[PDB]
UniProtKB/Swiss-Prot annotation, chains A, B:
It comes from Pyrococcus horikoshii (strain ATCC 700860 / DSM 12428 / JCM 9974 / NBRC 100139 / OT-3). This is tRNA-guanine(15) transglycosylase. Binds 1 zinc ion per subunit. Gene3D superfamilies: ArcTGT, C1 domain, ArcTGT, C2 domain, PUA domain, Queuine tRNA-ribosyltransferase-like. It holds the Pfam family TGT_C2. Residues 502-577 form the PUA domain. Pathway: tRNA modification; archaeosine-tRNA biosynthesis. One of its GO terms (molecular function) is zinc ion binding. Zn(2+) binds at residues 274, 276, 279.
Amino acid sequence: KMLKFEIKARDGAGRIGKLEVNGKKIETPAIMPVVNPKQMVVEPKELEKMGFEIIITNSYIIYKDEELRRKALELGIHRMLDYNGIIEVDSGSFQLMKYGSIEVSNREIIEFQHRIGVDIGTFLDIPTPPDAPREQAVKELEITLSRAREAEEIKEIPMNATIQGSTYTDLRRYAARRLSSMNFEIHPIGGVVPLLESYRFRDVVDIVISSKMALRPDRPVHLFGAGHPIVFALAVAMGVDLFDSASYALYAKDDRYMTPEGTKRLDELDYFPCSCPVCSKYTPQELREMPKEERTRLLALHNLWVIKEEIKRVKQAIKEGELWRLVDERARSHPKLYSAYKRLLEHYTFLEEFEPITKKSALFKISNESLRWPVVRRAKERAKSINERFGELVEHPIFGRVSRYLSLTYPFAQSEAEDDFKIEKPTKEDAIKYVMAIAEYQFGEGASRAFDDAKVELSKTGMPRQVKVNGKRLATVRADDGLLTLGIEGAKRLHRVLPYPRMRVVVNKEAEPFARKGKDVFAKFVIFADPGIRPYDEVLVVNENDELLATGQALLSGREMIVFQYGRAVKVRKGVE
Amino acid sequence: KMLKFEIKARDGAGRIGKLEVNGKKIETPAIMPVVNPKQMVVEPKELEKMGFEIIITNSYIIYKDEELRRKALELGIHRMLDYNGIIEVDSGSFQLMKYGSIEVSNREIIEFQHRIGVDIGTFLDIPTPPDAPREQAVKELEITLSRAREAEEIKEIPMNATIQGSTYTDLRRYAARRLSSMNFEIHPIGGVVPLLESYRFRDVVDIVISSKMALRPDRPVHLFGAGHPIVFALAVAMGVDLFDSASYALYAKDDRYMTPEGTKRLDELDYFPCSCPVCSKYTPQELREMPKEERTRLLALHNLWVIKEEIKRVKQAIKEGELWRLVDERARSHPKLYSAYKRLLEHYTFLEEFEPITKKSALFKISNESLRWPVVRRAKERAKSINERFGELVEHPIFGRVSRYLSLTYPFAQSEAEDDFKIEKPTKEDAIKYVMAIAEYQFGEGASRAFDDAKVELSKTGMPRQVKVNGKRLATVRADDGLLTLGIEGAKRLHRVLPYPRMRVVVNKEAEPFARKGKDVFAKFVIFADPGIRPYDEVLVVNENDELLATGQALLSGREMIVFQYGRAVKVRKGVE
Ligand SMILES: Nc1nc2[nH]cnc2c(=O)[nH]1
Ligand SMILES: [Mg+2]
Ligand SMILES: [Mg+2]
Ligand SMILES: [Zn+2]
Ligand SMILES: [Zn+2]
């Protein structure tokens, strides 16, 4: 294990992760600028100063140039580029996609990558073009897989194992499942460059989702060639963690200027809709008259700033549970991106497994699409049975109508549309009915039976809070989302009222003592867990004998908990000890 | 004539304008930072260095303070504030909002503003709150207008005549009519601060449109209190040319960070979604540790950069003919903004009057609301008749079905949605049918009768270009928009086929010679024009006797050509004499 990856925060199918490679730590989503070893528009040391702690170069281009190879073998790529962050390197597969044949063998560049002290390498995977004869897509993929097995045998460093299969979702699934069973640390998704250039974002969505579906969750995903800000928000919402960009430099040499919404020709710019170091002091009409070398430099820097800025924007949105809103905003950039956005939302089943149970932000109805967001479709179905049971429905701008008993609970209460939703507070005789409704809603069918005989306390306002029964607190309704926070007593009740494995996270014999003491539960110790658990659900920490050890909040889905070996699986609230 | 205002470019009902006062020019849309004479987070000279060439201060406050009072009379605000740009001042009406009455008379402040060398003054209009009872909306408006009448009498400086009818569109209309008929140079729209602070943007749209409907198009409109980047694109699209902001500073004082999509609390920021001098330099945490004063300063500056940046973004979009696409993107920032955006599109009649006829940018189907854009509804309606005659209905992504004869013309041809639309090139036999369908579509019913007996000469590609008869070239189908550019001969024919005033722009007797000569028609010399004329339409430059003087392209709407006293109204292609 030379590569460690763990989730720190999440939204949609996206996540902010901590990625460690042989001692170097980087936060994802992240973009690695592509550096041309022959003509570096922006010096690696300057990229590093700008905050780019990971970059990529062409080991093949280096290998072929006598001078470059000599220096790379003499000082290592790090000293050669005078860069200290993570240096990822490509294999020359891109030259393969352009010329068909390359003058170096898979084993050869791999060994070369090792010789120059590369942080992360890549083998000669074949980038089958889109809409290619299924025959070619298969023949090429098998070679890719063969070259992969070879790389798995000789690699001594972290390496990229790229998924191919052209535009055939079944080949994608196959590639993903196969490379997922091999010893590799990162899984790029290739062959998409031509799609991105053509703005065929819908096809990329299909390729990306089919790949993510078959890929094991705990490994970072890299979208090869997605180096333009316009796709960041969407790609990250699908679960992409890494991006690489050469366009920042190539566009600059073409007097092309990037924007989160697309690209513009410098000669069509009357104003700079940006405030970066470059745009804050210069002007379109000035830049246009500068020496090309200078014009290229300033554009490159600008492009890098906008790319860096989008990433930060995306991470900040994930942090506040607003990614979908941002994605919705960026979808209006281009008709094709809008097409791709609608398509992504059709994949409710894939998206639903990762969609957090509760978010910081309120549900915003800002378009027709938002009514199709994962959280909306989930709350709809989960409320159906709660309505035909508790009745007393009220009107809701977004969900139409929902029982007054869920009106204080996310996302019904925690949402906003064109018109405002009037939440109906409980009564002294009503309270418990709410707690029961929430339980049945948050924990599933039967959960109320753990609270029936309880007494709900009300705050200075008519809001439900502390839930008690013949003593100790069973749980508490949160003010922030109207969801229940389990106390050890309430956890015990749920445990006996709900059959195994509902709400369970089964831990290591070794992990048992810690959970009992209330320490947090770490993924590597989770041997099994309820497949229904969603990020942020209340959870029952248990041993194999299903004995309650503690209660806490999930940070991963049931499945992820099993698969993941790094990061916390559960944030424990209280233990049995 | 103490204020000149010219339209330099436009889109939607918005416009980029040239505003001159005291020989000081400024480009609009423009936002004026509100400056507090007592406390200044950022100082006028700094604001001037940042590029804010217009600001606003509270003359009443300056008045009520001995210190400022002396220095003001003594030095005159310009030197007092060490600012050399346009300085606008407010009456003290703001204090009226929160105090209901002040210790100064309409006449007193007005004369005081005159004494301190103010570039633009304001009288004591009463900012009636959003949903006041009708008797109050009415009472205060009459009081406002009496002060308007007094101000018009003694005025010796350009002044803001604020439209003030609360939330009664009929009162706004009246209020606008009256002030328009009076001698003032700028028209703010007031009583909206309470609405903006409550994100009640839909109500602001209704108030603005009802005001704009009754305002003289040639005068600048100012949305009083609209100082957050969130409403700019929307507001500009409604024809608002000026904004003032106090928020950039006040928000900073409460560690609130501005964004084109809204507002963020500093203690809730993990990353800065911006590249400005501040954000590209510091991190959220680095900011939180600084002393309150430094924090307030840096945040205030950041807010100013966001403001400045959105404006440049809005102006760039107008120049590109993509304002609506931006409004749409921005509509996704908040449910209340989305509600307002949809409402704005309900006001088709108002918007269509100012909406240009042809654009450089292609029509993008990026949302549901995209289908309700002015250009789309206009195209649908107009084409109905063409589809009824020339038939040959071909499929279209946005309009569904449309006669093939218009498939070469804007906005049908370039249009792009989830799937591209393929154009139908003419046959040497259908050629004429196209020129006729286009004419009927571009010039209105009957227009075709001016081209029936003509031959359409196709180019290197099966595209129609020059239209000739007997040897004289009537017009020529443009390659870019598929719209006809008239030739003096085509002009003549249309002149007799279409009943006055269709396509007519009537000029002075003094302008008659130039027009005949071929010179461009300036607005001030236009006495009357076809209400149906839209920006960029082909127009018939005629004299009062309806005698053809020349042909050209409109740069304003017919209604605008009449009221406007500055700028060109028609770019003449060719005179007659
Ligand atoms: N290895 C590799 N590099 C790429 N660069 C762009 N696309 C690809 C791809 O599919 N694979
Ligand atoms: Mg595990
Ligand atoms: Mg005129
Ligand atoms: Zn920039
Ligand atoms: Zn900033």
